Amino acid sequence: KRHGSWKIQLNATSVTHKPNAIQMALSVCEDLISSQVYAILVSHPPTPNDHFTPTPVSYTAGFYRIPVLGLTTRMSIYSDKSIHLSFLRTVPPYSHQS
């Protein structure tokens, strides 16, 4: 809306819950490599897998070094940018509570 009269536009792409994490990785990898997305966000708290693992999205996009924005997850194991090569988040993990 307010971003100039330049010819750039933005398309939306969204994929949802799957209980199987390998097929989550399959949906993410095919549907985001085939689409050429430039920025990927993750917004999945309410999983029955209570380990809170957005790891396949982060690893798949950090293969080709595409940034992944975590939105609800707050584990400090994702703070290691050497493991998760292109993962950022705008929520504080619990260690910063210290």
Partner: protein, 50 residues
């Protein structure tokens, strides 16, 4: 606002190389200062957090 802007391709067909300005785009995201926000003012620290 800059040149040398490449595209992450359809990497499933014959593309094993990385995207060239990956760390450059990530550094732009790290150096992204903001003064507007619904939940509050957002800024990335050295750990890339709020």
């Amino acid at each position: 606002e800059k040149e040398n802007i490449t595209d992450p391709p359809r990497g499933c067909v014959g593309n094993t190389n990385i995207w060239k300005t990956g760390p450059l785009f990530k550094r732009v995201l790290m150096s992204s200062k903001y003064a507007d926000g619904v939940t509050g003012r957002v800024e990335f620290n050295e750990d890339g957090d709020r």
